Amino acid sequence: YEIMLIRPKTIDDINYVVDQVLEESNPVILDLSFLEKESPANFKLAGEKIKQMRSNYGAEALLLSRCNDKNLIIIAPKGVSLVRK
Amino acid sequence: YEIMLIRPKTIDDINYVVDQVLEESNPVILDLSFLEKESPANFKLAGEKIKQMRSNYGAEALLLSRCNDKNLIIIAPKGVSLVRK
C-alpha cells in the first residue's frame, strides 16, 4: 500500500493523520516535533488522538526516535503488524 | 502486511534485512547504530546492500533520524510507496 510521512503543524493535519490510518489503512510515520515545540495544546491533542486510535480502532503506535528536532512515531493500522526482531 | 524493525549486529542480520525486503516484500525500519559504532566495515557493507536493493530491486530507502544512539532508515519494497505530505 502506502506509508505516509507527515510532520503535522495544525489540528487539521492531525485529523488527516487519523483519516490515513483509519479510513485508508495506511501506516503513518508521524513527526510530532513541530507540535511539541510550538503548541503544547495541539501536541497534547495529537497524543489523545493516538490514544483513541489504539484503544478504539486496534491501531499500534510505536515510538521510533525522539532526538535532535524530531519526535518520530509509527502508527500502524489494524492489518499491518509491526514485528520486531 | 508486516513492517519489520531490526537493529542488525552481524552480516547475517543484514542479509536477513535484505531477504525481508526482497523475498517477503516487507518494509524494514532499520537501525544501523550498532554497526556504525562497533563495525565500520559491516556498516559499510550494509550501505552497499541498501544501494543494491535500490538500484536492482526498485526498493526505496529513506533516512528517518540519525540522533542519540539511533540511525534509523526505512527501506520500502517495490509495491509499498513512501508518500510524504
Numbering used by the authors:
A (entry chain A), B (entry chain A): 65 to 149
Task: List passages from the publication reporting this PDB structure.
Here, we combine structural, cellular, and evolutionary analyses to demonstrate that SepF is the FtsZ anchor in the human-associated archaeon Methanobrevibacter smithii.
We determined the crystal structure of MsSepFcore, at 1.4 Å resolution. The protein is a dimer in solution, with each protomer consisting of a 5-stranded β-sheet flanked by 2 α-helices. In addition, a helical turn insertion (η1), between strand β2 and helix α2, is conserved in archaeal sequences but is absent in bacterial homologs. Interestingly, the functional dimer (as defined by its complex with FtsZ) strikingly differs between MsSepF, where it is formed via a β-β interface, and CgSepF, where it is formed via an α-α interface. Importantly, a bacterial-like α-α interface is not possible in archaeal SepF because a crucial glycine residue (Gly114 in CgSepF) buried at the center of the bacterial interface is substituted by charged residues with longer side chains (Lys, Glu, Asp) in archaeal sequences, precluding such interaction to occur. Remarkably, helix α3 is predicted to be conserved in most bacterial sequences including B. subtilis, but not in Archaea. In fact, we (and others) did not obtain conclusive experimental evidence that MsSepF polymerizes, and the three available archaeal SepF structures provide no hints about a possible mechanism.
